[PDB]
Design a protein that fits this description.
Structural class: mainly alpha
Distance between the termini: 32 Å
CATH topology: Actin-binding Protein, T-fimbrin, domain 1
Name: Protein MICAL-3
CATH superfamily: Calponin-like domain
Oligomer: monomer
PDB class: signaling protein, protein binding
Keywords: all alpha, calponin homology domain, Structural Genomics, nppsfa, National Project on Protein Structural and Functional Analyses, RIKEN Structural Genomics/Proteomics Initiative, rsgi, signaling protein, protein binding
Entry title: Solution structure of the CH domain from human MICAL-3 protein
Largest sheet: none
Assembly: monomeric
């Protein structure tokens, strides 16, 4: 979309943020807010990005889909407090999440890392 395009769902405000934050990881390459996350790596790359202690991506394996999720869903609420909307197994089995639910949920993270302390990393 070149300068001029009117309001369009594509490239949602939330997405962008993740596209910039997740930037750097491997395999993540956030392309959508449904499947790209289903894997779990993405979500994990979010918590680690700021707090690598809480969640360890390096350890996590791109093979584990239910784990990557089950973990975040726990770690997040554990420290962050963002209650999980669905279990890892329910997110690893489902064919595809719900745009809305996904965005709404993800937001929680952003709203928390939207204006994080100025202390550069």
């Amino acid at each position: 979309g070149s300068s001029g395009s009117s309001g369009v769902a594509r490239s949602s405000k939330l997405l962008g943020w993740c596209q910039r934050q997740t930037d750097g990881y491997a395999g993540v390459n956030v392309t959508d807010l449904t499947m790209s996350w289903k894997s779990g790596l993405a979500l994990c790359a979010i918590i680690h990005r700021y707090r690598p202690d809480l969640i360890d991506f390096d350890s996590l394996d791109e093979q584990n889909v239910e784990k990557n999720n089950q973990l975040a869903f726990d770690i997040a609420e554990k420290e962050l407090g963002i209650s999980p909307i669905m279990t890892g197994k329910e997110m690893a089995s489902v064919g595809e999440p719900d745009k809305l639910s996904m965005v709404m949920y993800l937001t929680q993270f952003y709203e928390m890392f939207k204006d994080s302390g100025p202390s550069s990393g």
